[PDB]
């Protein structure tokens, strides 16, 4: 697969009951009962879908579980619901305004759901017979398609003849034709003719011969966010702008016609509206203009639920020269509700370390787990989390499979935390370059 | 001009890039008697012609040349 | 049904020839600002003046944006209304002056009417009739083209020019398809195939539009509503051309460009020429800018220049600051973040804060819009909560209360649910007290 | 012959099977604990299981941080990707710095692909196409000095054959898997049809016509991202003239990254592809802005992020982009909490002497022992780097007087000609007009 | 080739040294500065040996003391075929390229690849061309009688040679060179036939010549990047060349070096006024100096204990101490009276100016009083004042008239400080009126 063991991959959903009551340890989350209950309330707000434009703020000290709670919300949200998780530094672009980047991030988080039916005729072409009239204005086509089980004869129109003359099939290629829409594709060449032409070439590919029933019926569901429609209706060939990001400040008229037409599509009954969540991690470093645009853009009907995370105290706001709580102005803090996380104790740190050791497939002893719990009490939690992973390798170099206290002590001595590094820098300040660019290179005076 | 001594492949590729027949046919037009020879005398339909006449018009007759 | 912080207000709620009443149209209180906004709405409906500016000022959570949206609802949907934020003018493609001029031209509308003489329907016959004396060296010299059309309850045979048969051949018009010919231009277009010719082939791509209703020939009067910015961006960009530059720019990124004053002058003079002919009506509208303290003094200076124009619409500005430095300047102290040059050019409407009964009534209306049922004692405790912390905090704590009421399998919010929502979700003041009384980078 | 530039005496970490460092081994003198920690990190990277692990090694200048990073890259081998970077390279004028950081993050994850090369090459002796205006197939006959071979070909390759202007008697090159057709030129058997011709004449190929070869392709994830994110479109195989409109870099969306990940995850399960994570090394991390420092926190939490190795030589220093954030090593405390710090200690006199002798050995110079003591004393007095960079002028001045060996007088003469920073500062201070 | 009127360092043809790298008192236009010239000769031997890479040398001293002259002497004594990239400090602050990318291009412009190849040519004198043509132009026949001063021959020509001779019309009496493989025909001119003008070639008609190409690494980097062609080498819009193609070129160059098909030549990158670089440039240079494909970087500066750009502290020579740890420093000194007189005499002989002895003593006195460059600038103005009164030798009063007409720095500062009420100060206050 293409996923390694991430920072928090043990979190699979939010560990709640049916009455929104959090279990002490379930679904990878340990502790934080009030924050998990509030996140369950916000999850029920998203799943209800009748409300729009609400702002919560997860405030706490570092290494407490704000982005862990956001990951739990994203995992318990389920599929086909848009969840757009960005950081604070992503909106500063050189060819897009901050307002336009925030508009695209807002409209990436609300989608529409469209159901459609497919009647597929997928098979290998045997023989195409083209009949031309004397006048030549109308043409007929005898198509011989086949599977491994049955084959039949189909009648074609002139538009079939034109569409098969383009991307021309050579009597032994695998195609698939739709009946309701007339979609035409060339999947490739069969493996029965793989030893025919002695050199394949540039623009060919080999597929298996399709088997089973030749006719198939399938209902498929598509979820398209409003940003995709905004990009597509802005150019001639717009999917290249969807995959390359060169959209470049899409205008407002196309946005309001897309809003009007999606309201008309909801009223007709073709499509339905799926609201989602926009998560902004480390929200404290946005400009004051972005905050102005945010608290004006939270008042629209086509607005998702915005989850913002920060860990600053009373700090200055970028773009101004004064300090504010959480690095956010009071106008934005008026239109918000705050979930506050609390620091852990010995038992919760021990349980989180046990879960992270189980997830990384690392076996520990009781004494090593107690020593790592004491280290995570004194130092932070992520230091012990990294200490587990390096102590596993130190264990495996000894031809031993379980991590002992000697390995934890060796990993503690080899790698330093913040406080010991600060002490060693401050005791030996002459050997480092200070703020004025002074350094004693030589060891002799 | 880029020159590589002792190879005809570079000369062929350079002459193909400088005088690409699709683009050079797109920036010009076929003569009318030639078009009559293609369509009537040779049976080639109209839609099978290469695309021609994509050069933008100058402002005047005086603006069409530097001489 | 989606509710988002608004849509409980349906206009200002004034009566005719008089003043605002106490509660009407989703508005509670704010009588004088509602009367002033109604006078401004009547001035806009008078459709005479140009470039008048209104700045409405007050504290946070007072109702400036609600008053602007009430003005937009009171005018109706045919009058243009351009909402804007002061942070939107800073673009990295074109200068902010051009963005302000584009948003100025977006707020003026043109209503045009026209008459179309059409012939549409399924083709019955298509015969290019030869001439009596064909010319030598040629083939099938055509004198006219006979086309027969069929629709719902009407068939009619036509007699056409020799020229249109070339367009029939280029548009690939066969027998049995549905065509559309306007009178003065010719220019037959193929709208589709009839549904009676759908099931003779198993596979096809062409769509099947059914037979059109009404007669084959009917003159229809259409009415189209555009803006001046649409005409500017349509005349500035080229039409469908055969040059490589036009097709190359159509497949590339639509980069915004500095529209010259010459194109705007030509657009205004041709619009005035067709207005004087009696065909076009000009509808000025509203350009609304929220949080105008974000503008710097260059945009303020260009606003001073552009408000004295001949065509500029009514501009409504909103701000909530007091004695503040203007952005882009280091030592200019000004009210509401607006320099005195612009302050001298507008009229200021002051908005006032609320009291406890008005907070309770606003919470009642926002509860009855969100389809919620609140107990009376819980309503009084929520009104006390809104008095102590904020109106918006009391308004935003309604849906967690409804969810917690639903989780206990009840349909009514009680005191215990609002206490649980108090304990779960914090406000700004208690979060600030938590930040101040902690020293772990909180 | 051989070029030495401040390195290449470093061959690795010089550890044994139990991970304990030798004193002088692999070109490394001293520095036991940092080498052991780097060996543990090398083993963790070779374990190929964890994503987003980070390491910061800090110490004074001229202590061995970049040498340890290069020793890690040499210990991993050339198969594992290794992306070196400086902190000033993240500031570009075409895209934002976060896009550059994400591109450098995805440049360190590689894929190994098993591929086959099949080649036909020889003289064209028969070129017969057959139809059923549209040709059906072409029979091409090839001849080399070991014999002939006939092939059938599709009209697609026939169009490229006709585009290459291939006639009877030309020596061609056909790749079976890709369909690429290359024309070499006419043969020497047809060199006497005219006295003067414009055609180049090549001899017949000596080997067989048909050749098969097993090859291994290494492709990073950024290559697969940039192969699909071309804004102008695809390019031809041969183009000496560029496209008329300049294609610049663009902010690649995450949807393209997800689809590339889907394609790679499908290809891995069939056994065609093998995934290899690598190392992103960023030297001089104190040049990073606070916005890049914030985006690094999000980028380290992804599922496919590689192992990042940082280095810094600062003390308690204000973070760039901020005013009053005093933090160790110029790194904000948010990122330091996700880091593991390895300390680097300075050297004493005997290790400086051993390093000078080791560098003199690899530069093929012969130094007298009394000159080596003077060079060690100079290295302890001013700098190790100043003693290392004065070896080549001493060699040149010894070669001037027809000597293959360094004397003390050459060291004194090279000290007289070239100054260090301290004596230059002393001349700077007691001067009148701008030195 | 290489048109040039007169430069400020045009009298310098190289470092004046013997076989033991000892400096002569006066040789190749360079006088004085013995230790600096010896150190630059040792640096030249470092460059000529080519076995070491990535060594940084700093040249620091007072202004107008032989720094750029030393760099020009090193560049002249290097000779041709060895890359030498001389840039200024303000040339990398671009609008389409980042600073590190411009520095990388300037680094990779100074390492060259030497490739020797052989080609065969037909250089001769056309005696007679006979062309037989058909009505429709189907089959063409051609006879070419062509000769040197040594042989004579007749060639049958195929159709493509007929087309290549009709295009670029070759007549009898011309001297042409034909390449058989590529079909390129060049008219060298006309022969000596009165009945331009070149000499008829000698020896064999079919010659085989070996040519040597020196291609910089930046050229192969531009060529291998498929997004732009070779015209970006001339137009300049290379535009942030990626590192993957740099890795491919770095592998393929070593692959060619191991197989013996090509050779490595290193060059010199000279950065004049290095103190104007930013701190991010120095941090890039600190890691870019340790590559195997890194040239020798010489930097020139004249600042002393100034502010480093991009920071707020002061550093020696305007450079941070980590960069100064990676460098060895050559220091220049101020000039005496005799060396100033010799330099002014050399500049007098360079500009074809005839000088009297007493005028030379006056120029030396006013050179040791004010500046070297001021007396080096007066010496050509005084020649025009001499030519105004119709005499060739510049006398004393001719120097005095130019001294009176044209001012120096100190007199201008004195007059400005005397009459500062008539000029614009820092605060923007001026007085234009004369009265009151
Ligand atoms: N309740 C929890 N249960 C399990 N793991 C947790 C919990 N809270 C925090 N963690 C772990 O702590 C680590 C760092 O915490 P993080 O979520 O980054 O806090 P913050 O976002 O405040 O920095 C994460 O890897 C996460 O797995
Ligand atoms: N007079 C009023 N009647 C009913 N609701 C009001 C009134 N004034 C304000 N509100 C409500 O208060 C909320 C916030 O007010 P807002 O218009 O944002 O004030 P401001 O624009 O000054 O911040 C809105 O959702 C609106 O519904
Ligand atoms: N333990 C060691 N053994 C041998 N050589 C060393 C050792 N440590 C450092 N060096 C040499 O000293 C120089 C220090 O350079 P570098 O490590 O890049 O400086 P910094 O540590 O400031 O980045 C390198 O050229 C390296 O070859
Ligand atoms: N040794 C020398 N020989 C000849 N000319 C010299 C010598 N030293 C300096 N000059 C002359 O003095 C002038 C100043 O030299 P230069 O090094 O360019 O100034 P700076 O030291 O400010 O860079 C030059 O025009 C040069 O011709």
SS (H, E, C) A157-196: CHHHHHHHHCCCCCCCEEEEEECCCCCEEEEEECHHHCCC
φ, ψ of residue E297 to 5 degrees: the values are -105, 120
Helix H segments across A274-329? 288-297
Strands in D82-86's sheet, in edge-to-edge order, are D82-86, D279-283, D307-312, D54-59, D341-344
Work out the burial of residue A322: count CB atoms within 10 Å of its CB; fewer than 13 is exposed, 13-18 middle, 19 or more buried.
exposed
How far is Cα D227 from Cα D123, in angstroms, rounded to an integer? 35
How far is Cα C367 from Cα E147, in angstroms, rounded to an integer? 107
| Interface contact D197-E158, CB threshold 8 A | yes
How far is Cα A183 from Cα A160, in angstroms, rounded to an integer? 10
Task: Output b/e per residue, D61-90; b: 16+ Cβ within 10 A.
Answer: bbbbbbbbbbbbbbbbeeebbbbbbbbbbb
| Interface contact D89-E51, CB threshold 8 A | no
Two tokens at A144? 């011989």
CA distances to A430, D347, D383, E324, E330 from D422, rounded to whole Å, are 16, 20, 10, 10, 13
φ, ψ of residue C34 to 5 degrees: the values are -65, -40
CA D46 vs. chain centroid, Å, equals 19
Using the Cα atoms of residue E105, residue E109, residue E113 and residue E115 in order, give the sign of their dihedral: positive
Resolution of the solved structure (Å) = 3.2
Name the one residue in this structure whose structure tokens are 């290193």: E266
DSSP D214: E
| Interface contact C407-A20, CB threshold 8 A | yes
Give the list of residues 6+ apart from residue E137 with CB closer than 8 angstroms, or none.
Answer: none
CA A398 vs. chain centroid, Å, equals 40
Q: A285: closest CA among A308, A253, A265, A262?
A: A308
Contact A374, A347 (CB under 8 A): no
How far is Cα D390 from Cα D382, in angstroms, rounded to an integer? 12
Neighbours of D427 (CB within 10 A): 18
Beta bridge partners of E355: E394
| D contacts of A431 (beta carbons < 8 Å) | 59-60, 346
Give the list of residues 6+ apart from residue A31 with CB closer than 8 angstroms, or none.
Answer: A24, A25, A344, A348, A351
Neighbours of D398 (CB within 10 A): 23
How far is Cα C55 from Cα A100, in angstroms, rounded to an integer? 26
| Interface contact B54-C245, CB threshold 8 A | no
Q: How far apart are the CA of D214 and the nearest CA of chain B, in angstroms?
A: 28
Two tokens at A417? 């935390």
| E contacts of D397 (beta carbons < 8 Å) | 21, 42
Q: E17: closest CA among E87, E67, E70?
A: E70
Q: E143: closest CA among E130, E152, E153?
A: E130
Ligand 3 atom at minimum distance from D358 CA: 4
Neighbours of E188 (CB within 10 A): 16
Distance from Cα C426 to the centre of ligand 1, integer Å: 22
How far is Cα D20 from Cα E279, in angstroms, rounded to an integer? 39
Give the list of residues 6+ apart from residue D256 with CB closer than 8 angstroms, or none.
Answer: A243, A244, D225, D228, D229
Question: How is E244-256 classified by DSSP, letter by letter?
Answer: HHHHHHHHHHHHH
How far is Cα C144 from Cα A69, in angstroms, rounded to an integer? 77
- Closest in E308, E311, E321 to A439, CB measured: E321
Q: B23: closest CA among B50, B44, B57, B56?
A: B50
Neighbours of C54 (CB within 10 A): 21
Give the list of residues 6+ apart from residue A40 with CB closer than 8 angstroms, or none.
Answer: A14, A16, A20, A22
Name the one residue in this structure whose structure tokens are 């090459």: D121
Neighbours of A108 (CB within 10 A): 23
How far is Cα A179 from Cα C22, in angstroms, rounded to an integer? 63
Distance from Cα D283 to the centre of ligand 3, integer Å: 14
Chains A and B touch (3+ CB pairs under 8 A): no
| Interface contact E308-A436, CB threshold 8 A | no
Nearest-Cα residue of chain E relative to residue B2: E230
Name the one residue in this structure whose structure tokens are 């690409």: B20
Using the Cα atoms of residue E75, residue E78, residue E79 and residue E81 in order, give the sign of their dihedral: negative
Contact C359, C386 (CB under 8 A): yes
Q: Which residues of E touch A (CB under 8 A)?
A: 308, 311, 313, 315, 320-322, 325
How far is Cα C311 from Cα C104, in angstroms, rounded to an integer? 9
Instruction: Decide: helix, strand or coil at residue C122.
Output: strand
How far is Cα D144 from Cα D125, in angstroms, rounded to an integer? 10
| A contacts of C438 (beta carbons < 8 Å) | 61, 313
CA distances to A58, A69, A308, C106 from A326, rounded to whole Å, are 10, 18, 11, 38
Contact E183, B7 (CB under 8 A): no
Contact D247, A244 (CB under 8 A): no
How far is Cα D362 from Cα D7, in angstroms, rounded to an integer? 10
Instruction: Decide: helix, strand or coil at residue A68.
Output: helix
Helix H segments across D2-81? 32-47, 65-76
How would you classify residue C31: left for phi > 0, otherwise alpha for psi between -120 and 50, otherwise beta? alpha
How far is Cα A252 from Cα A249, in angstroms, rounded to an integer? 9
Beta strands at C53-57 and C347-350: parallel, antiparallel or unpaired: parallel
Q: E11: closest CA among E261, E324, E386, E346?
A: E346
Work out the burial of residue E390: count CB atoms within 10 Å of its CB; fewer than 13 is exposed, 13-18 middle, 19 or more buried.
exposed
Q: E302: closest CA among E321, E289, E316?
A: E316
Contact A300, A53 (CB under 8 A): yes
Contact A172, A125 (CB under 8 A): yes
Helix (H) or strand (E) segment spanning residue A144 = strand A139-146
Give the list of residues 6+ apart from residue A20 with CB closer than 8 angstroms, or none.
Answer: A37, A40, A41, A44, C404, C407
Give yes or no for B21 touching E (CB within 8 A): no
Q: D287: closest CA among A216, A300, E278, E338?
A: E278
Chain breaks in chain E (C to N over 2.5 A) after: 195
Give yes or no for D96 touching B (CB within 8 A): no
Give the list of residues 6+ apart from residue A214 with CB closer than 8 angstroms, or none.
Answer: A121, A122, A123, A145, A146, A147, A149, A150, A151, A152
Give the list of residues 6+ apart from residue A172 with CB closer than 8 angstroms, or none.
Answer: A124, A125, A126, A189, A190, A192, A193, A196
How far is Cα D289 from Cα D321, in angstroms, rounded to an integer? 6
Dihedral, A67, A70, A72, A74 alpha carbons, nearest 10: -130
**Diameter of chain D by CA atoms?**
94
DSSP B38: I
Two tokens at D388? 């290392």
- Binding site listing of E for ATP: 61-68
How far is Cα A25 from Cα A16, in angstroms, rounded to an integer? 10
User: Beta-strand (E) ranges in E55-110?
Assistant: 56-60, 84-88
Name the one residue in this structure whose structure tokens are 């150190």: E39
Contact A388, A362 (CB under 8 A): yes
Work out the burial of residue C314: count CB atoms within 10 Å of its CB; fewer than 13 is exposed, 13-18 middle, 19 or more buried.
buried
Helix (H) or strand (E) segment spanning residue E157 = strand E152-157
How far is Cα E364 from Cα E357, in angstroms, rounded to an integer? 11
Task: Output b/e per residue, D305-317; b: 16+ Cβ within 10 A.
Answer: bbbbbbbbbbbbb
Beta bridge partners of C111: C225, C281
CA distances to A38, A58, A70, C169, C392 from C396, rounded to whole Å, are 14, 16, 21, 65, 6
How far is Cα E290 from Cα C36, in angstroms, rounded to an integer? 74
φ, ψ of residue D106 to 5 degrees: the values are -80, -10
Determine which residue's CA is closest to atom 7 belonging to ligand 1.
Answer: A65
Neighbours of A438 (CB within 10 A): 14
Helix (H) or strand (E) segment spanning residue E74 = helix E68-78
To the nearest 5 percent, what fractions of chain E are helix, strand and coil?
35, 25, 40
Q: How far apart are the CA of E254 and the nearest CA of chain D, in angstroms?
A: 11
How far is Cα D41 from Cα D51, in angstroms, rounded to an integer? 13
How far is Cα A357 from Cα A363, in angstroms, rounded to an integer? 7
Q: E303: closest CA among E324, E284, E288?
A: E324
Contact A62, A311 (CB under 8 A): yes
Helix H segments across D190-289? 221-226, 254-269
Q: Which of E63, E88, E339, E343 to mutate to test the pocket of ligand 4 (most atoms within 8 A of CB)?
A: E343
Contact E98, D91 (CB under 8 A): yes
A269-272: long-range contacts, CB 8 A cutoff, minimum separation 24: A270/A114, A271/A112, A271/A113, A271/A114, A272/A112, A272/A113
How far is Cα A206 from Cα A124, in angstroms, rounded to an integer? 12
- Closest in E180, E287, E331 to D427, CB measured: E331
Name the one residue in this structure whose structure tokens are 């389920």: A78
- Binding site listing of C for ATP: 58-65
Beta strands at D307-312 and D279-283: parallel, antiparallel or unpaired: parallel
Give the list of residues 6+ apart from residue E234 with CB closer than 8 angstroms, or none.
Answer: none
| Interface contact A333-C2, CB threshold 8 A | no
Distance from Cα A374 to the centre of ligand 1, integer Å: 18
Using the Cα atoms of residue E100, residue E103, residue E105 and residue E110 in order, give the sign of their dihedral: negative
Helix (H) or strand (E) segment spanning residue E388 = helix E372-388
Helix H segments across A153-211? 158-165
Helices E396-405, E357-369: crossing angle, 10 deg rounding = 30
Two tokens at D109? 């994850």
How far is Cα D429 from Cα B24, in angstroms, rounded to an integer? 70
Ligand 3 atom at minimum distance from D311 CA: 23
Helix (H) or strand (E) segment spanning residue C294 = none
Name the one residue in this structure whose structure tokens are 């605002």: C20
Beta strands at C27-28 and A151-156: parallel, antiparallel or unpaired: unpaired
How far is Cα D348 from Cα D30, in angstroms, rounded to an integer? 10
How far is Cα A303 from Cα A295, in angstroms, rounded to an integer? 11
Contact A250, A100 (CB under 8 A): yes
Work out the burial of residue C347: count CB atoms within 10 Å of its CB; fewer than 13 is exposed, 13-18 middle, 19 or more buried.
exposed
Contact D37, D45 (CB under 8 A): no
Two tokens at D196? 């003067």
How far is Cα D435 from Cα A147, in angstroms, rounded to an integer? 89
Give the length of chain E: 436
Helix (H) or strand (E) segment spanning residue A337 = strand A337-340
Name the one residue in this structure whose structure tokens are 């002939």: D148
Contact A262, A224 (CB under 8 A): no
User: Beta-strand (E) ranges in C131-216?
Assistant: 142-151, 154-157, 177-182, 186-193
How far is Cα D80 from Cα D103, in angstroms, rounded to an integer? 18
| Interface contact B27-C242, CB threshold 8 A | no
Beta strands at A173-178 and A184-189: parallel, antiparallel or unpaired: antiparallel
CB pairs under 8 A between B and C: 14
Contact D122, D143 (CB under 8 A): yes
Three-class DSSP labels, C91-107: CCCCCHHHHHHHHHHCC
Give yes or no for A50 touching C (CB within 8 A): yes
How far is Cα C330 from Cα C332, in angstroms, rounded to an integer? 6
| Interface contact D200-E330, CB threshold 8 A | no
CA A190 vs. chain centroid, Å, equals 37
Q: Which of E31, E65, E69 to mutate to test the pocket of ligand 4 (most atoms within 8 A of CB)?
A: E69
Helix (H) or strand (E) segment spanning residue A325 = strand A323-325
Two tokens at A174? 């695998």
Helix (H) or strand (E) segment spanning residue E415 = helix E409-418
Helix (H) or strand (E) segment spanning residue A218 = strand A215-225
How far is Cα D318 from Cα D334, in angstroms, rounded to an integer? 14
């Amino acid at each position: 697969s293409l996923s390694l063991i991430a920072a928090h991959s043990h979190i699979t959903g939010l560990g709640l009951d049916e009455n929104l009551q959090p279990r002490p340890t379930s679904e990878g989350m340990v502790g934080q009962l009030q924050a998990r209950r509030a996140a369950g309330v916000i999850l029920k707000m998203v799943q209800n879908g009748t409300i729009a434009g609400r702002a919560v703020l997860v405030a706490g000290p570092p290494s407490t579980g704000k982005t862990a709670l956001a990951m739990g919300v994203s995992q318990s949200l389920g599929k086909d619901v848009p969840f757009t998780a960005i950081a604070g530094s992503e909106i500063f672009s050189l060819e897009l305004s901050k307002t336009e980047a925030l508009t695209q991030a807002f409209r990436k988080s609300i989608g529409i759901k469209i159901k459609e039916e497919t009647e597929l005729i997928e098979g290998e072409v045997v023989e195409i017979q083209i009949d031309r009239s004397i006048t030549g204005g109308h043409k007929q086509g005898k198509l011989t398609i086949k599977t491994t089980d049955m084959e039949t004869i189909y009648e074609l129109g002139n538009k079939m003849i034109d569409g098969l003359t383009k991307e021309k099939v050579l009597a032994g290629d695998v195609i698939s034709i739709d009946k309701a829409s007339g979609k035409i594709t060339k999947l490739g060449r069969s493996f029965a003719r793989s030893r025919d032409y002695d050199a394949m070439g540039a623009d060919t590919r080999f597929v298996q011969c399709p088997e089973g029933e030749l006719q198939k019926r399938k209902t498929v569901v598509h979820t398209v966010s409003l940003h995709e429609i905004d990009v597509i209706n802005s150019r001639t060939q717009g999917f290249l702008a969807l995959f390359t990001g060169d959209t470049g400040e899409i205008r407002s008229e196309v946005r309001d016609q897309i809003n009007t037409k999606v309201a008309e599509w909801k009223e007709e009954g073709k499509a339905e509206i799926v609201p989602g969540v926009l998560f902004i991690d480390e929200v404290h470093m946005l400009d004051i203009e972005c905050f102005s645009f945010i608290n004006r853009a939270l008042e629209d009907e086509f607005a998702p639920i915005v989850m913002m995370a920060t860990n600053r105290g009373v700090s200055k706001t970028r773009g101004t020269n004064y300090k504010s709580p959480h690095g956010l102005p009071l106008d934005l803090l008026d239109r918000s509700i705050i979930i506050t996380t609390k620091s852990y104790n010995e038992q919760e740190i021990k349980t989180i370390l046990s879960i992270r050791a189980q997830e990384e497939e690392v076996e520990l002893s009781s004494d090593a787990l107690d020593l790592l719990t004491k280290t995570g009490v004194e130092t932070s939690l992520r230091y012990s989390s990294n200490l587990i992973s390096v102590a596993q390798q130190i264990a495996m170099k000894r031809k031993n499979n379980t991590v002992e206290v000697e390995d934890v002590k060796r990993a503690y001595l080899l790698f330093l935390d913040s406080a010991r590094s600060v002490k060693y820098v401050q005791e030996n300040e002459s050997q480092y370059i200070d703020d004025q660019g002074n350094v004693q290179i030589s060891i002799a005076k | 001009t880029i020159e590589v001594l002792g190879s005809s492949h570079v000369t062929n590729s350079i002459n193909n890039e400088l005088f690409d027949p699709l683009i050079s046919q797109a920036l010009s037009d076929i003569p009318a008697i030639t078009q009559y020879n293609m369509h009537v005398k040779k049976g080639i339909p109209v839609e099978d012609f290469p695309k021609t006449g994509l050069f933008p018009e100058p402002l005047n007759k005086n603006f069409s040349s530097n001489i | 049904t989606r509710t988002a912080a608004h849509t409980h207000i349906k206009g200002l709620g004034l009566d005719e020839s008089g003043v605002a009443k106490r509660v009407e149209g989703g508005f509670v209180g704010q009588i004088e600002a509602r009367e002033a906004c109604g006078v401004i709405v009547d001035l806009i409906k008078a459709k005479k003046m140009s470039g008048r500016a209104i700045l409405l000022a007050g504290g946070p959570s007072t109702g400036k944006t609600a008053l602007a949206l009430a003005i937009s609802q009171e005018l109706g949907p045919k009058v243009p209304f351009c909402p804007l934020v002061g942070s939107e003018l800073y673009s990295v493609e074109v200068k902010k002056t051009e963005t302000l001029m584009e948003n100025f031209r977006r707020a003026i509308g043109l209503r045009i009417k026209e008459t179309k003489e059409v012939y549409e329907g399924e083709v019955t016959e298509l015969t290019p009739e030869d001439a009596e004396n064909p010319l030598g060296g040629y083939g099938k010299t055509i004198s006219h083209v006979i086309v027969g059309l069929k629709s719902a309850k009407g068939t009619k045979t036509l007699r056409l020019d020799p020229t249109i048969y070339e367009s029939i051949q280029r548009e690939k018009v066969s027998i049995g398809d549905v065509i559309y010919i306007e009178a003065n231009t010719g220019a037959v277009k193929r709208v589709g195939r009839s549904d009676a010719y759908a099931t003779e082939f198993d596979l096809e791509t062409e769509e099947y539009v059914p037979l059109p209703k009404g007669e084959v020939h009917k003159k229809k009067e259409i009415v189209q509503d555009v803006t001046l910015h649409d005409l500017d961006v349509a005349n500035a960009r080229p039409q469908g051309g055969q040059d490589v530059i036009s097709m190359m720019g159509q497949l590339l990124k639509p980069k915004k460009t500095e529209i010259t004053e010459k194109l705007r002058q030509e657009v205004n003079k041709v619009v005035a020429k067709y207005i004087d002919q009696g065909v076009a009506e000009l509808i000025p509208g509203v350009l609304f800018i929220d949080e105008v303290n974000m503008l710097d003094i260059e945009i303020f200076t260009y606003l001073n220049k552009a408000l004295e124009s001949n065509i500029a619409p009514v501009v409504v500005l909103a701000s909530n600051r007091g004695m503040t430095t203007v952005r882009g300047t280091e030592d200019v102290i000004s009210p509401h973040g607006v320099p005195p040059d612009l302050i001298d050019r507008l009229l200021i409407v002051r908005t006032l804060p609320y009291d406890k009964d008005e907070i309770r009534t606003i919470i009642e209306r926002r509860a009855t819009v969100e389809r919620l049922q609140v107990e009376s004692s819980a309503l009084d405790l929520l009104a006390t909560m809104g008095t102590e912390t904020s109106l918006r905090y009391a308004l935003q704590l309604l849906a967690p209360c409804g969810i917690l009421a639903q989780t206990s399998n009840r349909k009514e919010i009680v005191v215990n649910d609002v206490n649980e929502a108090k304990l779960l979700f914090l406000d700004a003041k208690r979060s600030t007290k938590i930040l101040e009384t902690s020293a772990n980078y909180l």
